[PDB]
Design a protein around this ligand. Structure first.
Ligand code: A1LYV
Lengths: 271, 231, 58, 213, 337
């Protein structure tokens, strides 16, 4: 029992600082190296949002290493807002990347209106504005461990539902459709190369999304509920370990959506 | 190329009627169409314009809000919906085709016209020489003036010359103040400078008898009073 | 057979060889003189002032 | 700043732009096929089922196909082959009875296929390979061994092995197997095969564009 | 038979010696006293957008304002270069156009390609739309070039190794020009239209008499196919662009090459060539996506027109020398000055 909080202190200090630092370094490197059509529009916006997200890590890394926030309250609020807004913008852009992939599967000549560049830019701006708006309630007020527990818990539950769970369901549905299409049309001519790699990548997208985001979103709400009037220490520890996992997406995303794609990687070398 | 207007007749004051023009023998969809009317014993007066594709529409200030111009491109027909007919609306209405691209000749074909009888900032174009005695074989000039300079900054002088032979629709003679229209003899020549223009009919012969009208196309369209040439 | 082709080839070669030729130096001088005479009438070689260039900046 | 007629001309240019964009959208969704083969390779059969270039338009299962029969061009192929750099696929024909014929004809077909498949304009262009007149091959193989064309061949002179050997010989000419695919078909079945091959090509191209293939 | 071959070789040697006798000096030596042209830095005054495929040909109208361009999307667009307005958009029956021409009167345009047909379009129709005036058939190979002599005469080169003169009124070949052993790829009319020169894939260029139908002269020296040919404004010389990555200048009267325009850094083929009004500048398009301006009297690379993302397939200077238009496989035309 006693050793639990002693190790939780190290989790807060070194685990968070070290893990965030390595994630930030490699993630900025990947995002900048990776950084036209609707697919490219959504992918570029995803990379930009992931990059801008990582920029909010160094301050909190230094604070965790030192154990105190040294940049002031205004920068604290700004950092919180930018972090969460970019996180949920990345989630929504992943959802719309799944939608665009399903559309190009259904409409191979990009006939559908959603596949137009202008519509892609309009939807990107809509996503940015929407995420900024649903992030506004954070301003009145470490998100989970601050503010009124009653207001914070309901806000966090609604935010999880709107920005993670509904996008998760949409993404899973559209990628299930894509997987069905790829499996049904795997080999119309027996001698052709199979579509195993696209199917594996489609499965990996949803698996990675769920694994990285689901523990963090649930654990944040559990932590806020615990704050609301020694279970609390273990809940906080679990939230602490799960938090850097979700932020790993901004790290994996460039490689997954730009390097594991042979065509993109071939272009990147030639560039 | 043919334009046939219909829908004239007698209308009571304050009423409404629709003129229609049937186009044949040319690509109606690619032409902008004009409505031009002529009172029983006066000159031409521009009424309305509808662009190719219907994107642009204009009306004469004297008729703005009252008449409506519309076209049925698949049907190759032009309409003029007229409401609240006044005494001043009594005139023969002409349908005129106009195509606008570099080097084109607007106002090049006019319809035969349909007569309407009602029971009972603009550039001014002046043709103070209202009449001129004529003899075959002589050389005659028809002068004109405009309040504004018709020479645009792009080098074009937007002046047009129309000959209305007795009992006929006006026919385009010169467009843009120097260009001779197709099917016109080389005798006709246009010239002008300083907002003053002249039409020279050298060694004139028969078929050159009628009223000559000048028109400006610099900005929305005004006609001169018309110079009559008689033998 | 191919004899007709050979006969026509010889005929064309003989026709071509009979033409008169001038010295290469003289032709070079003629081209140089032509270019020199018309030098100032060439906008690409001698860019005209923007006041009279019909292709100006936006 | 513009005059009335200048504004009307700009409006006309806008309408022309609109029509051009509509035409481009209509054409962008059409499958373009280049049909190639020897002088007697049986591509006449292919066109039948479906003075210069001959264009054949047909629609199959909502796909519109532009098939270009360029065999009438006796001029230098090098000067106009780049005009077809953007075709989705190439349909190549070779009559299978050519093995024991003279202009050797099979070897000419292999030379043409080698020069086309490895062409710099068709690095990523998939090829639909039709091996026509299989019925004639079945009868002629019983008399003329396939070794008369391929001395190194040693399999039993039967339809299956000989035809498979010919297919392997043609598919071995592909020097870029990693980036390019060849869809071989011995021969409404051929149009169905072309539909399947082109739809597979389109799907793979789309997946490459979106970073999945 | 062998005697004819021997006599042909004897004539070849005799003409080779006759040309050599006249090669007393070189154009580069004679022009050593002239000042070099300054750096020719041109800029893209206008970009003509609207083609949705590779542009293969363009031709200026005689007014130096209107130009026609042909693209593989199956369209001829007539542009107002001053405003960039599209005056006309002509849908082609065959989308495989490879050449286009503008009539000197401006009343017609011509185009052709893999269809082996030269189609003449009337621009001044009473009905207000462009219509096919006439389709000239008779070539057995792709149409590579065509140029109007009048409203009633057009001369076309073909991939069937021949050039033809047509009477557009009757649609018949008035004259057929034969002698090239390879595909004729380009054609250039003399300013007087009394002669025209053609370059073929046999690496040679031939001078033709329009009325007599004869081959006046043959010019060799290129190592590969001649893709482009243009008459020098004087009318006594012409430049050839070849796949061997060089341009060469031939003189009709000296009957031999005068100068070659090449650089070690240039290893790609030449798709088009043109002269400036004075002829001092030789502008050539290249497969390496940019045009190079050459000092025609000095052989020096005087400038570069680097504005295209793909092969520069065509270019042309206005009749007043005020601008250069370059078409490209990237589907854009740019006006330079
Ligand atoms: O990144 C996180 O883990 C939480 C973060 N939200 C923030 O508001 C934030 C940003 C930067 C620093 C801190 C911060 C606040 C109190 C501290 O006190 C301390 F002593 F515990 F460090 C230490 C750091 N909080 C998020 O948006 O996810």
């Amino acid at each position: 029992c006693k050793n639990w909080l002693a190790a939780e202190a190290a989790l807060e200090k070194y685990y968070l600082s070290i893990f965030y630092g390595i994630e930030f370094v490699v993630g900025v490197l990947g995002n900048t190296i990776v950084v036209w059509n609707s697919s490219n529009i959504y992918l570029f916006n995803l990379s930009v949002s992931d990059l801008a997200f990582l920029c909010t890590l160094p301050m909190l890394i230094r604070s965790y290493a030192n154990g105190n926030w040294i940049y002031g309250d205004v920068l604290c609020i700004s950092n919180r807002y930018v972090l969460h807004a970019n996180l949920y913008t990345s989630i929504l852009f992943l959802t719309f990347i799944s939608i665009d992939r399903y559309l190009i599967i259904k409409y191979p000549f990009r006939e559908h209106l959603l596949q137009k560049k202008e519509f892609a830019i309009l939807i990107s701006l809509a996503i940015w504005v929407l995420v900024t708006l649903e992030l506004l309630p954070i301003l009145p007020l470490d998100f989970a461990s601050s503010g009124d527990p009653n207001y914070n818990l309901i806000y966090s539950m609604c935010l999880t539902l709107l920005g993670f769970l509904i996008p998760l369901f949409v993404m899973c549905f559209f990628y299930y459709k894509i997987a069905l299409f790829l499996k049904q049309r795997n080999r119309q001519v027996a001698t052709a190369l199979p579509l195993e790699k696209p199917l594996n990548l489609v499965i990996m997208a949803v698996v990675i999304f769920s694994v990285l985001f689901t523990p963090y979103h649930v654990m944040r709400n559990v932590r806020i509920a615990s704050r609301l009037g020694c279970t609390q220490v273990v809940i906080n520890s679990f939230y602490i370990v799960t938090r850097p996992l979700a932020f790993l997406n901004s790290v994996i995303n460039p490689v997954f959506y730009f390097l594991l794609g042979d065509h993109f990687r071939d272009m990147l070398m030639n560039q | 190329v043919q334009l046939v207007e219909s829908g004239g007749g007698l209308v009571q004051p304050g009423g409404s009627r629709k003129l229609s023009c049937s186009a044949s023998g040319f690509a109606f969809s690619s032409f902008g169409m004009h409505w031009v009317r002529q009172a029983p014993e006066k000159g031409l007066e521009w009424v309305a314009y509808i662009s190719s594709g219907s994107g642009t529409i204009y009306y004469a200030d004297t008729v703005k809000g009252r008449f409506t111009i519309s076209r049925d491109d698949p049907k190759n027909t032009l309409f003029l919906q007229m409401t609240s007919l006044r005494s001043e609306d009594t005139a023969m209405y002409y349908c005129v085709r106009s195509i606008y691209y570099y080097g084109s000749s607007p106002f090049d074909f006019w319809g035969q016209g349909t007569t309407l009888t009602v029971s009972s900032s603009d550039i001014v174009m002046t043709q103070a020489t209202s009449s001129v005695p004529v003899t075959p074989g002589e050389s005659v000039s028809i002068s004109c003036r405009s309040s504004k300079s018709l020479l645009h900054s792009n080098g074009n002088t937007y002046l047009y010359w129309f000959l209305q032979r007795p009992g006929q629709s006006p026919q385009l003679l010169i467009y843009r103040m120097s260009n001779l229209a197709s099917g016109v003899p080389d005798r006709f020549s246009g010239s002008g400078s300083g907002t003053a223009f002249t039409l020279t009919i050298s060694r004139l012969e028969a078929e050159d008898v009628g009223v000559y009208y000048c028109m400006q196309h610099l900005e929305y369209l005004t006609f001169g009073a018309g110079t009559k040439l008689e033998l | 057979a191919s004899i007709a082709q050979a006969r026509k080839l010889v005929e064309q070669l003989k026709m071509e060889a009979n033409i008169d030729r001038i010295k290469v130096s003289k032709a070079a001088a003629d081209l140089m003189a032509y270019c020199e005479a018309h030098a100032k009438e060439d906008p690409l070689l001698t860019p005209v002032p923007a006041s009279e260039n019909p292709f100006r900046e936006k | 700043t513009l005059s009335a007629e200048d504004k009307a001309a700009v409006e006309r240019s806008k309408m022309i732009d609109r029509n051009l964009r509509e035409d481009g959208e209509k054409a962008a969704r059409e499958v373009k096929l280049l049909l190639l083969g020897a002088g007697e390779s049986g591509k006449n059969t292919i066109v039948k089922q479906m003075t210069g270039i001959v264009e054949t338009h047909f629609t199959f299962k909502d796909l519109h196909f532009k098939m270009f029969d360029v065999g009438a061009q006796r001029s230098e192929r090098k000067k106009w082959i780049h005009c077809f750099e953007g075709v989705t696929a190439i349909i190549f024909c070779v009559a299978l009875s050519d093995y024991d014929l003279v202009l050797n004809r099979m070897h000419a077909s292999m030379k043409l296929f080698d020069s086309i498949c490895n062409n710099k304009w068709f690095t990523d262009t998939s090829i639909i390979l039709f091996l026509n007149k299989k019925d004639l091959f079945e009868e002629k193989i019983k008399k003329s061994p396939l070794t008369i064309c391929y001395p190194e061949y040693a399999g039993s002179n039967t339809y299956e092995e000989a035809a498979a050997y010919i297919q392997c010989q043609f598919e071995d000419l592909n020097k870029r197997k990693d980036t390019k695919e060849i869809y071989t078909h011995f021969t409404t079945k051929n149009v169905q095969f072309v539909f399947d091959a082109v739809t597979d090509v389109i799907i793979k191209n789309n997946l490459k564009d979106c970073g999945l293939f | 038979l062998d005697q004819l071959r021997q006599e042909a070789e004897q004539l070849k040697n005799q003409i080779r010696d006759a040309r050599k006798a006249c090669a007393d000096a070189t154009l580069s030596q004679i022009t050593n006293n002239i000042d070099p042209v300054g750096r020719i830095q041109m800029r893209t005054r206008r970009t003509l957008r609207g083609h949705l495929a590779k542009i293969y040909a363009m031709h200026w109208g005689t007014d130096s304002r209107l130009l026609v361009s042909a693209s593989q999307d199956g369209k001829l667009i007539i542009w107002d270069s001053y405003t960039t307005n599209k005056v006309h958009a002509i849908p082609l029956r065959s989308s495989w156009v490879m050449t286009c021409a503008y009539a000197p009167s401006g009343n017609y345009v011509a185009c052709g390609g893999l269809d082996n047909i030269c189609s003449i379009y009337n621009l001044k129709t009473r009905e207000g739309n462009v219509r096919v005036s006439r389709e000239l058939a008779g070539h057995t190979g792709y149409l590579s070039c065509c140029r109007f002599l009048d409203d009633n005469q057009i001369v076309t080169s073909s991939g069937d190794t021949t050039c033809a003169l047509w009477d557009i009124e009757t649609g018949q070949q008035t004259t057929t020009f034969t002698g090239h052993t390879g595909d004729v790829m380009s054609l250039s009319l003399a300013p007087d239209t009394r002669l025209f020169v053609s370059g073929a894939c046999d690496a040679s260029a031939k001078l033709w008499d329009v009325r007599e139908g004869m081959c006046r002269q043959t010019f060799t020296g290129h190592e590969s196919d001649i893709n482009a040919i243009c008459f020098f404004p004087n009318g006594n010389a012409f430049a050839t662009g070849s796949d061997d990555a060089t341009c060469r200048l031939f003189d009709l009267r000296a009957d031999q090459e005068l100068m070659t325009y090449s650089h070690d850094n240039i290893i790609c083929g030449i798709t088009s060539v043109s002269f400036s009004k004075s002829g001092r500048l030789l502008l050539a398009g290249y497969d390496d996506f940019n045009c190079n301006v050459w000092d025609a009297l000095k052989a020096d690379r005087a400038g570069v027109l680097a504005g295209h993302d793909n092969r520069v397939s065509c270019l042309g200077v206005t009749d007043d020398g005020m601008a250069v238009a370059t078409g490209s496989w990237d589907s854009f035309l740019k006006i330079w000055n």
